Structure formats: structure tokens, C-alpha cells
Design a protein around this nucleic acid. Structure first.
Lengths: 98, 90
DNA sequence: ACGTAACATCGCGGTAACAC
DNA sequence: GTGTTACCGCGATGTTACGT
């Protein structure tokens, strides 16, 4: 345990730079991994696109978050689709499984 | 050591008899002494090289390293795009 | 022994564009 | 407004040659 994180079946190991789902490795791009990581490092908290851009992208084209959110949800699959919830007129947030 | 034996003071490695350069050996050792962990180029430059160069010598060294291993064990060194490289355990 | 030279490959990822 | 999928420039890595 160095920088390892666990939420439900999602494990996000910064060390080895891998993200798993009860053993199924995720082939995430870099920004897809930094986005999923930041959101899970802050479960339940809704963030805005200008927030997520500043934190994950770094200090216009704000639908990149939405695309990356969709690429993320897509790779998570229907069984884990809902780990990224949407808050109309606010932004996104990681949704803890029960 | 999963088919791979690195001998420290001899500065050699055997993959059941790899002939490696000093930098190729320092890079393989540091990647295998921390197997599974990904290291950046800044990291591997300050740890394995003395220098902080931009340079593409790490990428070149991985390649020379990979070639010696052969298409059997060249997977032992993984690439993590936009991050760096890592040793991969069979 | 090593680190540029220099180009080939290919994946990142941001914009476009429309459905709803 | 957001879900969503193309499309394609660009840039990260691969790779080998060559100069020191």
C-alpha cells in the first residue's frame, strides 16, 4: 500500500499505474485514468468541469470532460456504468456502490 | 528472478547469458528490483543515470534491452504511455 | 558505451456534430 | 445541458544509424 485506493470492486493502484475491476484490468488512457483517480479519491463530491479541468488537465472546450466521462463509463461497462454519476447543471461525481 | 538472474558485483545478467552494457544493466536491475512499479524518465534519469538531461536515451536503452531479451522475454519491460517504463513479472 | 539524428508508427484526446 | 461517436492533428514511443 503506497498510493493504492479501493472503492467497491474498483482498485486504482497509482504505484503500478493500473486500475482493476475485480480482476479485470482497465485499459484507460492517461487522462481517463487521472480523471477516474481524482473522482474516486473524492467519492460523493460533485465537481464542476472548470474544477476538473484545473485539477486533472491543469492551468472553451469543456466537453472534453463529458467525452472522457463517456469513454470511462464505456470501458467500465453496464455493471459499473453508474460509478460516475451526472449532476445536471453542475458536473460529475464518483458514486460509491452500496 | 522469473527466468532472470542478475548478478550484482559481476554486473551481469542471465536469462537462463545476456551481454548488456553498464547502463542497460543498471536500468534492468532498478526496474527488476522494483518490479511492477512504473518509473518516469526523470526518475530513471536521476536514479540510473547521473544526469538530468530533454533526452531519449531511456527509450533507446529500453530498446537495446528489449532486443537482447528476445521475443520471449521482451515483455518483461512494459511501456506505460505518458508515464514511463516498468518491469513486468511473468 | 552512449547519447543524439531522424524518421515511422500509432495512440491521445480535443473538436465537431447531432440526438434528445 | 449532456450522451455520444466520429475524425484526424499531434506528439509519445519504436527504432536504428552514426558520431564521439
Amino acid at each position: 500500500g503506497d498510493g493504492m485506493l479501493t472503492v467497491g470492486d474498483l482498485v486504482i493502484e497509482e504505484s503500478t499505474y493500473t486500475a482493476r475491476l475485480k480482476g479485470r484490468a482497465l485499459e484507460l488512457t492517461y487522462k481517463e485514468f487521472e480523471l477516474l483517480k481524482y473522482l474516486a479519491q473524492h467519492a460523493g463530491r460533485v465537481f464542476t468541469r472548470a474544477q476538473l479541468l484545473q485539477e486533472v488537465w491543469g492551468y472553451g472546450g469543456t466537453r472534453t470532460v463529458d467525452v472522457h466521462v463517456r469513454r470511462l463509463r464505456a470501458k467500465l461497462g453496464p455493471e459499473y456504468d453508474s460509478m460516475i454519476g451526472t449532476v445536471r447543471n453542475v458536473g460529475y461525481k464518483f458514486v460509491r456502490p452500496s
